[PDB]
């Protein structure tokens, strides 16, 4: 809908200007599930929009049958690759073996693993054969994110964490971590908050962070103390930022409540970054907002990884996949423009 | 949206009419709270309850004059220390809590507090229900209720909110009390939620929520799965399922496409949460971001009608709460017919 | 002198029990046969008709030290050397049968039965003796260990040390002052019950308080534990006054009790104080002993199937006679209930 | 036994004259307690302190005339909410606990409690000390003191009792506050008790109590041994020994006969306990069946002089306690000019 | 050697079982239809009429590698590719039914069933084959998992790996050497029973030792666990000699047993060794294999409803043959239990 | 096989010849044991040590002269209670354990027990070594040794066995002492074993054993990987690898085929076990079913040479044990010239 339509549009244009400012180059983005119906319709929409050069994984023949089966003339010159047959396959196996030979994985096992398109996608982005990847529209979340974590890994002091946008009529809220960590520590919560914060900063918005709890500034043993400590750590790391907690969710989003009941709070003007204390709360919240709050909700997107990779959920729509790939492109460009410095 | 409240108001009238026209006596510890009083104006125009206010009679009349609402004069006003049943109440609280760290002086001082006094009023039949906690935090407001009124058999104190959608309403629990309920506690919460939904002539369809879809893995997935099983064994006629993600629960299309083995068909109308972080955070986020109205929380599992507001409540929230307290009070009066 | 009046009544009951049982005196074996102090005690008691003592050690060594402190009334006393007693191998055989699956081999067992403590124990267990008194030479844990291993507890019983505080008219009973680090609610109830039976033996109504640092709070930890212990004790003997959790001054002082906690079922001051942990019991009884004017006797071991007592390593000679007296009484009481 | 009390009283007079004849202001939240007023009768006639009574002015004047006590007709009596610094006091408390669950309404209503008000008065220098808790249980009374006045640096709040023997005096700690103190905490307590004993020109000799004589075994014995080692390393001039049984500690003859290696000769005069059950049971049993008079408990480790009585306290117990509260207030004021 | 005799006996007993069952051979499926070692094994196995092998993979790849390794006797052998088989979707539906509440949806079930291990498993489960051998190609946990998810355990049974140590005279059986990290007393008892029932099949008296670092100590930890395990085992099978806790030399050397522990119900030396945890069983069998002169066969999977074994990938061709032999033998046993 | 043992004997002869003809003094607490006396019979004709027997002098001559031997009347015999340095020994033991539950009488009684006496003989330089425990179980026998002689700096008591093959020898540890050694502790055991292996002129190659090959998974895999890393960081000159299975550790062909990245080439000759079950069961199983002779256990990590047998030992085992005990005694005596 409407708010979603303007948001994505600004993003599509920035990928246009970032490609137009690096010689017109498009980010190379690999899709392990080359035969997915949903993914292919999405790519159809995506290629006329000049955002990425897609790379598809699977048997060349089987996917060409399925794209023709799905009536799409705009998608025939795109690279299609079967991992075992790619020329860089064995260097990739040796690399994975090198990475996990002391983590229960032997050489044969590395070969078997690298044959799975997820691992191959990850190794492609990791070795620079692709700029980014989108995976997991058919497999469950944990299993899809695992190769990304083993192969691409996190940036220094970073923590893998899923992030969603709920798009309101002027502003947007960001929610994390919605997919990865069961029960993040105070330290992990602070880090999750900082990652969410940089994402908000990309969009030119001042980040205002709340560490969520079932309590309003109580600091009692358990989740309240944990979110209070998390805000204290985040603040020690970024003294320029409005970061506050522990607080209830309405206290966080509604500044009128804040200023009336807790005026001492350093969080003024309503939070636009919401950090959850555990996975039950984040997962349940973003999904409920999506289904009954009737507010537009995009994501989840993966934060904390060194190269751009995002895993879809199985319930994702086709335009949802387009959103995900757009942001994968933006992230890839962001990273490559940051590695030039 | 407005339809639901107005309907309930009609039911208060229909029940009161079927009982000789008396309205449920509802006590308010916060007698000088602005919100409680003007909301009370709006509800008192509607013949929903006979309000009893606690405080100094004179401070309450001064602040009644201050908010220019003549329509609630002549309503009963009581100062706890000066009520004739005061010493008897103190004696009661004492016998209840003398082996729980409380001496007679402590009992006296506690019964002077409007919350304890209200609680005891409801417990002794001096009132039918109470609405408190627009000024103090939930734990502190709910505590005298748990100590005085208590739970019914095998019951569990649990907060429940309604999400009122376009045709449907969803019920959410436990949104206020239990930090990390067990499987067993979750089943009980489900059962309580279910009875509430049944009151409204709707068949309960229950979801035990998790971050997972039917995995049964160690931790929350297994706990909510086991909860579903326990609920089914205590009441086999019910549509109760889990572990499942929230969208899987509320969206029948997702259910039908991705998990057709599920004994839950048609979208859930009861969502039981795995812990207080998720339940509290969710209902408050929905109330603030979704168009849908959220009423509550209402305290389930207690022997008499008692409800704690959230401190962040608007006045419409308070009139809504008082309405559903009234209904609850007459439902209870009707279950006490046995 | 409360100690002398108190012991004197006891001595009269051992005398009363010995009559009507053919005039027979309980046989009590003493593992430290070469100890100066034990012998000093035996001198005083053979003059008092309380038991027929059996001493363990080498006959030559024992007559040596009996000759050294000039005591003629204990010549003609039963003296036994463990390896040379005739039932020795039958004994080693039973200990072996008892502990073959609890780390003990036949040789190890052999050497253990050679230890005076284990043999004294096995003697009482096989009915070749009626009671024992041990550990005037060895440490407490180390002395009680063979007793628990050979003699054991009676049904539902729990090993527990008990002291008497003798005041100007009544006495207080304190337990458990020696054995259990951190008794559960259940165990505290059993401790209470055993103490109570002792008090009942003296014709006094037992009045039991489960001690805590709290007055009826039932809060998490020891308060809830002692409240629950009293509820258990009350369920097991509903005729008895048993109450808790409460503070010690609340416990012993009835005026304090009635002024502050009239709902309490304990009226008249406690005469049995059951403690929540070993620190409280041990420290209390020893302090009462050292700064309190009042005399404190014990500790005596309760809960065992046959009459056994462990002394302290620091114990005096009168400590040994009152200990042996109580041991005789215990042996007689048991033999008389085993009568139908 | 009363000899010790007289020595203390005379010192109160001596310090009082060395500061212009000025008396320590000590506030008593229980302004209407018969016990406190009778004890204050004895104290004002003894020139030990300037009393501050908390409550409604007229009700306590009513009860001082009602209980026939003419020597405190003119004493300062204060009702908290009507005090001129009431709102600034609410602001400091609010500021202190806004992130520990307390909102401004809760701050106001708390500051109304005489306990909280006594503590804030001493905190802000409006009074020099306070004695409370003859009517409420210990935890509830000591809490505002810990929240408002707090501990001094590296300090640990702990109750200390004096055993007055016919000869020496013994000190017992921690007799009221901490359930199961660690080695480090036991050491700290030993040092605080030690400084108290030094105040009286006495060499403190410290014993860490246990059920064991120098075993150091897993549990309480190791803890009391390690606590003695810690104490010895933190203050090498003091005789501090453990683990040991109590009779070993107080009887020097047993010490020389059985453990001549101990660095403690001459019998202990500072007894530090392994847990709250042992300290509480012990001092109370000694007080009730022991022939020695026991005073306290006194709270150590706090920045300003504040002491909580025991509920079982006698009136002579209160006069004793307040005498030593005065001495403490003076020591604290004389060290604060540095 | 010892291996050659034992294997010949197993083979002759497979032949003896094929009689009275119509000359029918156990149907055994090999998901790794293209494994060199397995095909090499299958030559030897089919000349010996041990099983009717079913190969999984592409018909053309497997016939190509059959031709490439010159084995003429495996042309016409059943070869099935999971995806093109007629009961494929029915198999997917069954797996979906088994794991829909354990995190697997219909699509995940489809993909899993596409894997030869899962398809093999489901064949055994559905009676379209009698047994399976996998994992000469993948590491152990991954290979054993589909078997447990599809085939499962029998009543009160436990997945457990078992090895034979073949000596110059006797054989010892070792378990559990592959699956369970730290089995309980109860689980150890079950493991012992499974090892025993196997020993019984060969007409041998099972004599079982619960191994520990201790001799009949029953102390906290693994000693108490192995003694308790032995007690549970005895209570379920009183005709059997089962003893513990004991040290290994005590267990296998009857002269030691009789000299130091005559009370022990284990006389004549153990031939079943049940280990307290996976470190000890796994390290034990590998050290025996590598430094003793003793031959070691296995591991074999016990506790499963139908006949399935996983090789280790480090397996030799003769190893695959042993595995298939004992798998066939097991299959026949199980079919003999379905005879009432 | 026999060659390794004869080589040890040949070296004890070489040091015994090269330091003036001195034979290492070795004490035996069980002076009346048949097994020990038969071993002593084989050993005294081999000039490896000066034996001292413990028990009643006349009783040990009763059983030794009586059963098959003419070469044992020339031997040292000691009854603890009658030895001239007895009371001095109890005095040092008292000093060592006075704060560990043992008082002077208990010190006397322990020192009358031959095990404590033997250890104290070695500790005071009055003897060079001891061999004990064919009559008592292992723990009870090793305790006086640990309480008296103790560990060297950063050392940890650990039993070590040799498996003797036709070319190599392997060491297995810790086979006797620690239930579930930590990563740090395992590294330490590795280091002590490596030191013994260097002594025999072989380069140590250490493998940390697991049920897994380089998985590093939660539990034992991670523990042994971590142990190998710590050990390498303390001794970078050593080949140390893990976590790995036993065939992977001992068989170098397996290593190069399956795990070519490993820093361990040539097969491990030092095997460190993850727990007491695996170590004890392993060495006993190899001992009973493999052709190979297994000697030990020998107690490592302790300051002076002391060793405990298991009863399951044969006489030839006692022969071997006393042999490396004498040799050990000579090595430690050579560190004592510094």
Numbering used by the authors:
A (entry chain D): 436 to 776
B (entry chain C), D (entry chain J), F (entry chain L): 439 to 776
C (entry chain I), E (entry chain K): 437 to 776
Sentences from the paper on this structure:
To verify these findings without using mutation, we were inspired by flavoprotein methods used to remove tightly-bound FMN32, and used a moderate Br−/urea wash step to generate ligand-free MaeB. Washed samples of the native MaeBPTA PTA-only construct (hereafter referred to as PTAapo) were crystallised and diffracted to 2.72 Å resolution. PTAapo retains the same D3 symmetry as the acetyl CoA bound form, and, in agreement with our HPLC data, there was a clear lack of ligand electron density. Loss of ligand binding results in locally small changes; however, the use of d2 as a stator and d1 as a flexor means that these small alterations are magnified at the isologous d1:d1 interface. When superimposing the two states via d2, it is apparent that acetyl-CoA attracts the 3′ loop, pulling d1 and d2 closer together.
